[PDB]
Ligand binder design. Structure first.
Ligand code: XYS
Ligand code: XYS
Ligand code: XYS
Ligand code: XYS
Ligand code: XYS
Ligand code: XYP
Ligand code: XYP
Ligand code: XYP
Ligand code: XYP
Ligand code: XYP
Ligand code: XYP
Ligand code: XYP
Ligand code: XYP
Ligand code: XYP
Ligand code: XYP
Ligand code: XYP
Ligand code: XYP
Ligand code: XYP
Ligand code: XYP
Ligand code: XYP
Lengths: 638, 638, 319
């Protein structure tokens, strides 16, 4: 059945093209496997809750915007009952019943790893013609807010410009008592009843209220203004849109924005752990997180039941925690051709869960061909990045590009453009960095007081757990570019490491013993055919490299809106360093997990296509794009 | 069917009382669930291999010695083909076929955690009228061996007397080529063909060659001379007798001795891990051990299929590694009323697997009413001692009594007599030490570089894994006795610990954060109503205790052969301390595992009977025996 | 490491091309993940038992015949100790130790779903210049066997031609006592000591004795004459060659023949069920089979641990 939803409809109707339903949730309450729901032009202010599940990739339930029609799903409501208090501050008042059981003005940003605990923030928000406001703590702060033009990036401790300074003068404050919710805001001269002013009301826009609602496709919608909660790996992880612990969703061709915390969630649900560290306070989030993995294994977490979602061709921006988030629920998923930007720039709250994309246990997840910029952190893979492949992505204008934490691999980072000045946080082992352009520093550190799980290949089955001893990384065919005063760009971080698993084994076994003898020897690194320009430094034992500290590539990423270009100068010597095609055969297995770099189906992986998807021969230029050559280069990269 | 085996029988017979079989293995090849095999007087030189399984506790397959008859199963053969070489050295030669696939003179003591790697030892042995010999490395060492009267105990680094000094002059050496096995030995003047001289030949005496041969009872035999291999938790763990990865055995009323390494094994089998650290050399045994736990979970390791064995009323002695050993295969078992002595005293080889009883993952195992003495280490619980209860045991004349390593509890040590000068090695957390007599030091240490599993209660299901942060121990009603020059007796070890979980939580949560904030606060200890004599020292914050540094109890354990007595003097103030009866209600839950001290069935545990099995009154005196009193005490304890 | 095995070798050698081992099982006892075992021209009368496992599709242990060389692994032995009894019937006698723990002349074709219960058959066999014989039940049946040219196909109940009619006149019968095995056979006029006469001896040709020996490749061999047992789904299922409950084998480019029952087995092992219907007789094989599926699931039967084998480019016949 093909159901239709339109603003001329009725929920008492048949749901046909000629007698359509009025709300998307009515269609969601009757559609069954194989059905399609076509939504016609309009703004639908509701939280859509798919009731029945799709039964296979063939028998999905598809929700889509009608061809050529603009369909918006919003979690907000327009408010036209404001009254002027004094100056530019206005006030509205609503019955608590307006919000039901979830009131964004009462609910706080709260939970494990949230660090800004002194100034409480809430899940509400106020918008003036689409622009969100900044929450203030006290009524008095409403009247003469100060324009701010700079802000401290918490992780890098660097003062950076505020992207939208004017927005810093628009503030809101609310109070909720037993009966009413009262919201105040400074509109800086505008009349909020005349302008288009909205407030957050609902938690999500498209998200099942039961788990296991598999095989849903959601396509072609604009979705916005969701009061989503802080979403650490140790809690339920709702988002503006997400599968809620199920398998096989396809979220595509959507424009998603203004999720308070995370926009798309492919995370976990509450029964396997819900902020126990913050509520019970007896054990740290670290301890409760490794327990949640086993709780989930008992609650069906496996390829058969959870994951294998596809998130493609979406534009996601202006969210406070993440464009995409999730622990466990994203295993075996694919994330590609998305444009992600402006994530967590307002910095109203901070904690260790923020990034354009953050995934915990991203087992065999493929993240490729995405454009990620203007984020405090572009991508964060945290625990169990086993089989994960980050390939052919464009990262720029981020405070940091990529962070791979407490993982053991095998994980692959290939053919990417990592152009920010702080390119990689590496608190893992088992990585392979192949054919990337890396123009920023790498902070590489061991993690000896946290052990985290590893798995059987291509599975959620647990094989063991380990601490991060550091090293056991491969770097081949990368172009590194440093800059004045910037330290730690390149691969010199590994200078004390062994250079082969054979050397490591020989050194450890020189004197009889067990763990202590292994701990005294540094793990191997496999590094060759990299170039180092403008201050980047190589691993001292690399055999074949090109080092020209004096050469300045003058790299620039030029964003022209829908298109993006890369400008780069390369030295004549670039023609003389040639890269090999890497594959499962050429990449040494990781030591602790004892696994190969394979495709998700267990077959050989061959890295013979570049960032522009051009097939390359046996001997080609190093770096992400085969077309790069000595001299001037100007290449369209998006 | 009741099958009979007798030395007047025939394996071509019917196996009845009137027409009995000749070998025990013939009966083992035909007996089925519910049958009994009765073995008549004689020495049976064979390895019995139960073929079919018992099907329930009711439908067991029972192997027993005929009432009032002496039945011996031996892995050796008597050798009467010795020829004098020179002096007191004699030689015999056998075809390699005499040993089949397993030749003790070729097989080495080998594997993970074996520390004596310089001079290789083998699994063979030579006996003169029952007395085993010492292996020597070179042919030349056979001729004038030197009497040794003292030896270094490896762990304690103390020089101690050799129990049987004369035995040190009896030595053997062997060579195996592609055709023959040649064995040389110094008989110090005796004629080995006239005396009764035996050599090890077979690996085991009573042990299935297939796993899953459940519900077998083995009763009333003497078994001896088995060439058993080094048995670490990361390898197959064969023994002289054992269930070989199955459920429900009862091993009772047997006299077992002269197993090269371990005598009774309730350990694991090879498919879940087999000396990978020693063979592959890429990862430590630590890493391969935690992997073997998950390999076994996938290979049916659960209460439904493995464990629940009963080992009772046996006498086990003169073994080189352990009287009882086992990783995983012993879950939910009961070990009681056994007499274990002379374990690993020859010190021909050493490594981290030696103890009278060593069990890894002794989940809900009950070890009680055992007499363990003259061992280098009496009891070693290593990893996953969750629910384990060590109660009413008698430990004396051991270099060390009890070692609980890398465990998280809840584990209970109650009403025991630990009389050795080095009483406890505690490298765990989550313990409860209740009503013991502890006359030696405790070495307590954190373990921050190894994380090990913990489980759901009463189950093999994995709940998580943790490092040992130290503390989270309970000590109530114990009598501690120090000695001149002996440090670390008592509970002062915990002086920097918090005194309740409430205090720990309040201190950790003073400053916001996660794991680092928990790590900076010491775990709680629950200590009260203990006595400290002769130099023992208390936890400074203990509220109610009795400390008399100048009172000397003059403890003595008097072993008269079949009976043992405890001689102890107590001060007048002794009965001023009134101990409480401890139970699930009185014992605070362990922190990391978040579990209670319960009975194996999940119900309340009440510690209301003492070492002599007397019911304890609400208002009892402390220590292991309620009848202890001020003044002189002379009590039969065995 | 690339190990070599050749008839000019020694198991006391290093196992290199210049100093090769003599038996394939010697190489199988030392090869580790990533190694290759190259076997040179010859007939290897042994049961090869891979000891260590391969660790991935990349780090396999590969056993292969040397390029262009004919390598045969057989479970039989040639017998040249035949004595004529009478007419065309000859006899040989072998101490039971010649067979060890598995004697094909004692072992019966037995088990769940076997229907020919009246006349017992055994796992032994006799071959004359490669042609197997037909077992007969009694000593007297050896002397004047009758040529048969048609036979009843049991399922279809149709009488069909016997493909090799002449073979029906070649019969064997054996007796096993406490000390030795006596095998009789009618050679129809040929001298079995002069012709090439073989008898089954070993159960398998290439099969691990432990389960979990993953990622082995076996390529390019001729393998033949294995005394394999009846292999229903409710029993251990050994074959002439097989992975024995593991993952990732590649069995390719081999010529396999004359397995008594099954040649290549990718079946189950004994612990999940072993002819309980036939031995216990309380429940049918149907009931025990559905139970074996759950017993195997508890034992880790899953894509991660079992299966994903490749059997390709082989010629398998006369089983
Ligand atoms: O940190 C942000 C930076 O990455 C860029 O997007 O400009 C705006 C800043 O707030
Ligand atoms: O390279 C970084 C850039 O991408 C942006 O985020 O501003 C801060 C710089 O350090
Ligand atoms: O040896 C190769 C291995 O790398 C795997 O990927 O399968 C293909 C094989 O050819
Ligand atoms: O260490 C041993 C000690 O515990 C006692 O048994 O006497 C003999 C010593 O070897
Ligand atoms: O107390 C110990 C005793 O039990 C024996 O082992 O000899 C050494 C002493 O330290
Ligand atoms: O593989 C995907 C398939 O599962 C889906 O149905 O359509 C899109 C494809 O990319
Ligand atoms: O003046 C402050 C303003 O700068 C910020 O954006 O919102 C908080 C206000 O108090
Ligand atoms: O995940 C499931 C949860 O959604 C349901 O509410 O409770 C049962 C769980 O298995
Ligand atoms: O356990 C995760 C940890 O590795 C990271 O630092 O951020 C906090 C949690 O998301
Ligand atoms: O690089 C991309 C890879 O990462 C993805 O998994 O499959 C498509 C490729 O182009
Ligand atoms: O400034 C934004 C830009 O970064 C994005 O790429 O396109 C949308 C603009 O609002
Ligand atoms: O299970 C029974 C056990 O409880 C008892 O102690 O000994 C006999 C066994 O059959
Ligand atoms: O003391 C003996 C020594 O002389 C011999 O070499 O090795 C065996 C010991 O018992
Ligand atoms: O992993 C075990 C370890 O904890 C102990 O020290 O002995 C070695 C192993 O048996
Ligand atoms: O430890 C316990 C012991 O004290 C009691 O006497 O018998 C049951 C055991 O579990
Ligand atoms: O220690 C004693 C031992 O020496 C003796 O041989 O048998 C009894 C044991 O208690
Ligand atoms: O059942 C017991 C309950 O009554 C008590 O309150 O807590 C301890 C439990 O064992
Ligand atoms: O040899 C190849 C094997 O390794 C792969 O797994 O499947 C394809 C085969 O050709
Ligand atoms: O004569 C019979 C023959 O036809 C058959 O092949 O083997 C059995 C003999 O009895
Ligand atoms: O434990 C079992 C092992 O004994 C058998 O050999 O192979 C299957 C395993 O499940």
């Amino acid at each position: 059945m093909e159901y239709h939803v339109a603003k001329t409809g009725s929920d008492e109707g048949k749901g046909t093209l000629k007698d359509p339903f009025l709300t998307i949730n009515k269609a969601a309450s009757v559609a069954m496997a194989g059905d399609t729901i076509i939504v016609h032009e309009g703004v639908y202010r509701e939280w859509v809750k798919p009731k029945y599940k799709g039964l296979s990739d063939k028998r999905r339930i598809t929700y889509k915007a009608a061809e050529g029609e603009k369909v918006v799903i919003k979690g907000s409501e327009r408010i036209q009952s404001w009254q002027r208090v004094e100056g530019n501050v206005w006030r509205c008042q609503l019955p608590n019943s307006f919000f039901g059981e979830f009131n964004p003005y009462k609910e706080e940003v709260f939970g494990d790893w949230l660090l800004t605990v002194n100034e409480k923030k809430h899940l509400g928000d106020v918008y003036l013609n689409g622009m969100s406001f900044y929450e203030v703590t006290n009524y008095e702060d409403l009247f003469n807010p100060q324009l701010r033009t700079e802000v401290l990036d918490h992780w890098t401790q660097k003062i950076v410009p505020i992207k939208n300074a004017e927005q810093t003068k628009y503030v809101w404050y609310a109070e909720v008592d037993r009966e009413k919710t009262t919201i105040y805001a400074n509109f800086q001269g505008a009349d909020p009843n005349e302008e288009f002013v909205e407030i957050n009301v609902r938690r999500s826009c498209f998200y099942p209220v039961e788990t296991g609602i598999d095989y849903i496709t959601v396509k072609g919608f604009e979705m916005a203004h969701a009061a989503t909660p802080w979403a650490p790996p140790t809690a339920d992880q709702p988002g503006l849109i997400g599968p809620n612990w199920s398998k096989g969703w396809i979220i595509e061709d959507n424009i998603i924005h203004d999720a308070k915390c995370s926009a798309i969630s492919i995370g976990k649900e509450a029964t396997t752990g819900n902020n126990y560290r913050s509520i019970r306070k007896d054990k740290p989030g670290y301890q409760y997180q490794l327990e949640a993995v086993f709780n989930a294994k008992r609650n069906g977490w496996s390829k058969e039941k959870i994951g294998s979602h596809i998130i493609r061709n979406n534009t996601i921006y202006d969210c406070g925690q993440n464009a995409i988030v999730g622990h466990l629920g994203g295993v075996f998923s694919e994330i590609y051709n998305n444009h992600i930007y402006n994530i967590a720039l307002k910095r109203e709250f901070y904690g260790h869960e923020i990034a354009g994309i953050k995934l915990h246990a991203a087992i065999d997840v493929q993240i490729h061909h995405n454009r990620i910029h203007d984020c405090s952190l572009g991508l964060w893979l945290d625990w169990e990045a086993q089989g994960t492949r980050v390939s052919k992505n464009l990262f720029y204008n981020n405070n940091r590009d990529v962070f791979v934490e407490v993982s053991h691999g095998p994980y692959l980072v290939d053919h990417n453009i990592l152009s920010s000045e702080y390119a990689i946080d590496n608190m893992s082992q088992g990585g392979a960095y192949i054919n990337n352009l890396i123009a920023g520093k790498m902070n590489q550190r061991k993690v000896l007081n946290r052990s985290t799980q590893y798995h059987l290949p291509h599975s959620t089955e647990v094989a063991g757990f380990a601490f991060v001893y550091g090293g056991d990384d491969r770097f081949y065919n990368n172009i590194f570019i440093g800059k004045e005063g910037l330290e730690n760009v390149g691969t010199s971080h590994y200078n004390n490491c062994t250079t082969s698993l054979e050397e490591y084994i020989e050194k450890v076994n020189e004197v009889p013993g067990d763990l202590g003898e292994f701990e005294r020897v540094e793990q191997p690194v496999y590094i060759n055919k990299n170039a180092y320009f403008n201050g980047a430094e190589p691993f001292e034992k690399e055999k074949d490299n090109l080092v020209k500290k004096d050469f300045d590539p003058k790299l620039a990423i030029i964003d022209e809106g829908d298109e993006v270009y890369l400008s780069l100068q390369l030295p004549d010597e670039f023609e003389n360093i040639v890269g090999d095609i890497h594959s499962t055969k050429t990449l040494e297995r990781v030591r602790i997990v004892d696994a190969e770099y394979e495709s998700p189906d267990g077959k050989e992986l061959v890295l013979d296509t570049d960032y522009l998807d051009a097939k390359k021969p046996e001997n080609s230029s190093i770096g992400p794009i085969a077309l790069l050559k000595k001299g001037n280069n100007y290449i369209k990269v998006w």
